[PDB]
Amino acid sequence: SATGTGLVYVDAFTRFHSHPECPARVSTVMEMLETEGLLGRCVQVEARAVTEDELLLVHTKEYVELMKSTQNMTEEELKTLAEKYDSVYLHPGFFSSACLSVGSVLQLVDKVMTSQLRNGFSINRPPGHHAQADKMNGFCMFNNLAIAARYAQKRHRVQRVLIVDWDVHHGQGIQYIFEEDPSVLYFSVHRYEDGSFWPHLKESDSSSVGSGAGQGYNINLPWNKVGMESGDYITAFQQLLLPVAYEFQPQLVLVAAGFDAVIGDPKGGMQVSPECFSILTHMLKGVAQGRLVLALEGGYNLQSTAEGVCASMRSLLGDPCPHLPSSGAPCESALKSISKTISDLYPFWKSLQT
Ligand SMILES: CC(/C=C/C(=O)NO)=C\[C@@H](C)C(=O)c1ccc(N(C)C)cc1
Ligand SMILES: [N+]
Ligand SMILES: [N+]
Ligand SMILES: [Zn+2]
């Protein structure tokens, strides 16, 4: 029986930066983890730099070289290149941080799949779930979890990987990468508002269920109203994700754990209590024998994000689930979105058919 919860963090995550995506995100998460006495209960795991071969599992050779050459670029060359991407800034140390950010999750995948640890959480920036095979996007250079997913498949002989994205933003990067791939199931719960919320993509609706052999293995649930709560996410997990999850039977679960959906986040617009992420985390522990790795994505209110991380951490540590301040009943708008997605993937999953 594997035991212990891995925690990867290195000061290098704070060496690149009004802007919402800042080193303050990660530094104050670690501080709240300590003062809550959660940090000392984790097994501290070293970070490592991702190798080129590992990056090439997801990203193109030309893109990797362009990103590597950003190290020596002038702040005007970084200005030029970054302007050709959607919502992306560049920094001389972005490449190093991005490399250590990916490797941090690979470190945790190794420990969980070799049963040295039960589960893990990398407090890493830059985030990844928006990054694509040949381009930067949404403050992401490399796709942390996509790389980790195929890494586990190659190195640790994993057949099926489930990726859960509860960040308020749609991880179109992950969706694009495994679009035709049935070995990796992608689930994304995100604010959409019929395309008026960033990234403003039609591919972010529940209509996109994948293509080819990957049909049915891509699941988007789009909120079309702000102010969603814990009762909405829990109902969404209970009626959609988890039925599919147990039918899918993954051997590793990766979580794009952004916390911009927590109450008080300026960007998300939702009202999800921090304690809700303790429940969602706990649900996912019943899948893949608890083999569960979380990686930081979004979240822009420093205290709310820190609370979300702590709440997720307690469940990783096997602490009792917390009391929920909000109602257990979901709203009508949430039910509409859940119904629509279920209807869109109905013929692909037996468990959805009632
Ligand atoms: C991309 C993103 C977060 C994604 C996320 O968190 N994914 O999980 C937020 C965007 C909309 C944003 O707010 C923004 C702010 C400033 C800016 N520039 C000053 C250029 C460009 C974009
Ligand atoms: N998401
Ligand atoms: N997929
Ligand atoms: Zn986000």
Does residue 186 line the site of ligand 3, with CB under 6 A? yes
Distance CA 8, CA 79 (A): 31
Domains defined for the chain, CATH in brackets: 1-354 (3.40.800.20)
Resolution of the experimental structure, in angstroms: 2.2
Tell whether residue 11 is among the known ligand binding residues.
no
With beta carbons less than 8 A apart as the criterion, state whether 187 and 165 touch: yes
Q: What are phi and psi of 13, to 5 degrees?
A: -70, -15
Query: CA separation (Å) from 30 to 34, 49, 224, 239, 335?
Result: 6, 21, 33, 34, 36
Distance CA 311, CA 302 (A): 14
Contacts of residue 176, defined as CB under 8 A and 6 or more positions apart, other chains included, come to: 132, 133, 203
Closest by CA to 280, choosing from 294, 268, 269, is: 294
Does residue 232 line the site of ligand 2, with CB under 6 A? no
With beta carbons less than 8 A apart as the criterion, state whether 157 and 141 touch: no
19 catalytic per annotation:
no
Residue type for 184, please?
V
Closest by CA to 128, choosing from 101, 110, 100, is: 101
Q: What are the helix and strand counts (H, E) for the chain?
A: 12, 8
**What residues flank ion ligand 4 with Cβ within 5 A?**
167, 169, 258, 260, 298
Residue 74's CB is within 10 A of a number of other CB atoms, namely 9
Ligand 2 center from residue 66 Cα (angstroms): 27
Distance CA 318, CA 155 (A): 28
Ligand 3 center from residue 215 Cα (angstroms): 8
Tell whether residue 181 is among the known ligand binding residues.
no
Tell whether residue 169 is among the known ligand binding residues.
yes
Does residue 299 line the site of ligand 3, with CB under 6 A? no
Contacts of residue 198, defined as CB under 8 A and 6 or more positions apart, other chains included, come to: 87, 138, 169
Distance CA 191, CA 222 (A): 6
Angle between helix axes 276-284 and 302-316 (nearest 10 degrees) is 40
